């Protein structure tokens, strides 16, 4: 039967891929990086505490002016914050309080959010009316919306629980490209600086490098033992760092098609909710269910430091494009800005 | 006198205005009762919604005696529960709707499975979840008007071969209720309210009010040290 023939051939292809990856394992990062000086100790201090949410904070995204924050909570409120003074810019009531994602457009004109409504709501912050209106509702998913990022002001990228990612044209509300091929729930996206390639992590113990222009998967990365919750890109676009429930962070190379670095510690048994990089790529940050955020040295796989100002599970993190602060959310309704 | 410029004083006034409005919205939301509505497909969730005068999550607001309930019907979602249920940690109650006829009728595409067995597996998966250890469960068993005939024709041994009782409403119902409750391994800390209803029972709302009132009293009594 061709049913087994095809799957047997697929197994042969998986073996060929494994062998092609092993053929390139002529070295490891943990051998080269032993000769470079250590990152040292990173003692970070709380600089700002942002209060005003009354419920769990699920998502954050920094703008590209490095000053504004978007903070979404399940209290049906999405807040645009001025990070330099703790002043609040904008309070936005939502049509559905069950929000899990948020985004600030790179230009600041538009804000995305959504969650357990299968609709991604896009709000327009700069109107002649002066109020904050719903500019577009993006419907079409059959599952929950897990992460939303902007590609440009006219193009939005979504991830959903129906085992797919999508590229929406914000002016029409219709899908133009749909990225299928996942078997588990898709939890979080990261967008390359080059706008041309995006990475999708899923609750299948897998991550994919998707070409956004053609609508096809370019590279399937494996290695995780459990569901992946968070992904980010290396500043150069050639590597991404992922985090999962297995208390491990992993760095993957988009050019070698291999797992490249494993970040783990004997004292870490809690799942990971969010991962981000500093501008220089030397520091890998991750928020853990153990009520803190750890800062890892990407090169040596040591623990450079900890941030322990939260009383509950740490949710999404954000790092400004300038490197001039790390913003940490939590389920205790406070945001903290660490520099 | 405060080192701040005019526009920043104005923005701070805006911030305080927004903070007051958010606090008012919080005060209103905290006087609302949140209920998580779960159950198997074709369990009659629409029948409870209609009787109580109540894609994605279906949120409905229903008020009784000036107290407000927000019922969240999630049965239309298709995703792994362990990832999205964390947003429901702070509810006061979970309503679980089950059809009794499920004992001798198939819901799943697998004819071997008894949809009452899958419903009680779901009930165990919820009741003993690490997010609902102090969140009470209100269980509604529907379609008793249709159930007497199944009892006359189909003893429960199809679903529970170790039923030794007679083919009557009361004994079979007691056995089923007990089998559902016995999946709760936290008997000392979490209560289960069970009500038998039918198409003509409008008392469902009064029952929900009574059970929610008991939930709030139990939680307040355990907080103040009388429990």
């Amino acid at each position, epitope marked *: 039967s061709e049913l087994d023939q095809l799957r047997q051939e697929a197994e042969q292809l998986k073996n060929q891929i494994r062998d092609a990856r092993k053929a390139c394992a002529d070295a490891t990062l943990s051998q080269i990086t032993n000769n470079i000086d250590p990152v040292g100790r990173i003692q970070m201090r709380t600089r700002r505490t942002l209060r005003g949410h009354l419920a769990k904070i699920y998502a954050m995204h920094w703008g590209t002016d490095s000053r504004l924050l978007v903070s979404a909570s399940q209290d049906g409120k999405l807040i645009i914050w001025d990070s330099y003074t703790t002043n609040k*810019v904008h309070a936005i009531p939502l049509r559905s309080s069950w929000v899990m994602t948020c985004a600030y457009a790179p230009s*600041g004109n538009y804000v995305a959010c959504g969650g357990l409504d299968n609709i991604c709501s896009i709000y327009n912050l700069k109107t*002649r009316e002066g109020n904050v209106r719903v500019s577009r509702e993006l419907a079409g998913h059959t599952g929950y919306l897990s992460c939303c990022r902007f590609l440009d002001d006219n193009q939005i990228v979504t991830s959903s629980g129906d085992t797919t990612c999508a590229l929406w044209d914000i002016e029409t509300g219709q899908q133009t490209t749909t990225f299928t091929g996942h078997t588990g729930d898709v939890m979080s996206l990261s967008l390359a600086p080059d706008t041309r390639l995006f990475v999708s992590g899923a609750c299948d113990a897998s991550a994919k490098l998707w070409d956004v222009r053609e609508g096809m998967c370019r590279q399937t990365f494996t290695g995780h033992e459990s569901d992946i919750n968070a992904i980010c890109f290396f500043p150069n676009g050639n590597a991404f760092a992922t985090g999962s429930d297995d208390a491990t962070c992993r760095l993957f190379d988009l050019r070698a098609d291999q797992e490249l670095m494993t970040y783990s510690h004997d004292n870490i048994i809690c799942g990971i909710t969010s991962v981000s990089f500093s501008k220089s790529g030397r520091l890998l940050l991750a928020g853990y269910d153990d009520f803190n955020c750890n800062v890892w040295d990407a090169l040596k796989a040591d623990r450079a430091g900890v941030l322990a100002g939260h009383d509950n599970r740490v949710s999404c993190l954000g790092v400004t494009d300038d490197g001039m602060a790390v913003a940490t959310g939590s389920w205790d309704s406070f945001l903290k800005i660490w520099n | 006198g405060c080192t701040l410029s*005019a526009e*920043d004083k104005a923005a701070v006034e805006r911030s305080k*205005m927004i903070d007051r409005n958010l606090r008012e919205d919080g005060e209103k939301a905290a006087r609302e009762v949140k209920l998580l509505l779960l159950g198997a497909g074709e369990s009659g969730k629409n029948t409870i919604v209609k009787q109580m005068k109540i894609t994605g999550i279906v949120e409905t607001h229903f008020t009784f005696k000036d107290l407000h309930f927000k019922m969240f019907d999630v049965g239309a979602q298709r995703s792994e529960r362990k990832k999205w249920i964390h947003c429901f940690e702070g509810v006061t109650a979970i309503i679980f709707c089950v059809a009794l006829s499920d004992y001798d009728l198939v819901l799943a595409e697998d004819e071997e499975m008894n949809r009452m067995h899958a419903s009680m597996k779901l009930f165990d998966s919820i009741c003993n979840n690490k997010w609902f250890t102090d969140t009470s469960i209100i269980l509604f068993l529907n379609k008793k008007d249709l159930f007497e005939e199944k009892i006359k024709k189909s003893p429960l041994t199809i679903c529970y071969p170790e039923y030794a009782g007679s083919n009557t409403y009361e004994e079979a119902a007691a056995y089923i209720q007990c089998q559902f409750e016995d999946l709760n391994k936290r008997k000392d800390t979490k209560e289960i309210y069970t009500h038998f209803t039918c198409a003509t029972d409008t008392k469902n709302v009064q029952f929900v009010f009574d059970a929610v009132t008991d939930v709030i009293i139990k939680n307040n009594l355990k907080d103040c040290g009388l429990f």
Partner: single-chain antibody
Amino acid sequence: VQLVESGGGLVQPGGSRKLSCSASGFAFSSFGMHWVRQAPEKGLEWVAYISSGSGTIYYADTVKGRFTISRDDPKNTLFLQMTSLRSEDTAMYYCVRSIYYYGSSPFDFWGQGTTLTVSSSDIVMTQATSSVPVTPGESVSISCRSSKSLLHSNGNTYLYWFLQRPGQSPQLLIYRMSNLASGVPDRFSGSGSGTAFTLTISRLEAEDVGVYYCMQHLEYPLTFGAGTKLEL
């Protein structure tokens, strides 16, 4: 987006009037507002600022104790109660919307104005000239001076440029020296520091030609420049 002022006309000295600004097309209660006095022979003068809520109300030194602002958010309206009017108070009055936050657009919309003919430290800014001839198609550079530096330690400047077309209410042209208002084509710009600022204009169109005014938002009370008229 409409602002309708009313309640003007001829008043005898010593009397009082109630002017009314009717707001439509925006979230009035979310905005602060200004009333601005314009004397046909003198130009723009700031009168008063009402907060979006019940916050501090600022008045010009020349009207304090005589004029009051009443605000009715549920109706999106403003009222000016003018007591003890003097012949110096004869003027056109403008209702102006504003909002103050990071990236906000203060002073970005002015009403049509209502005329109230009446019978019979601080910081000063100056205009380089009250009038200058211009040639269509060529660029123009309009400079503006202040008695105090407009750059605050927070890095921002508070110099506003306004354009008043003949027969029309003045429009907001530039925010904080370099930020263009929505709807303005990429022909206008400005720069400077301290007490010397310049408005740079590319090729002139007939739709541009009017009187340009400086406004300083550093501290209340607010002031205006003399105003430079372009003659085509």
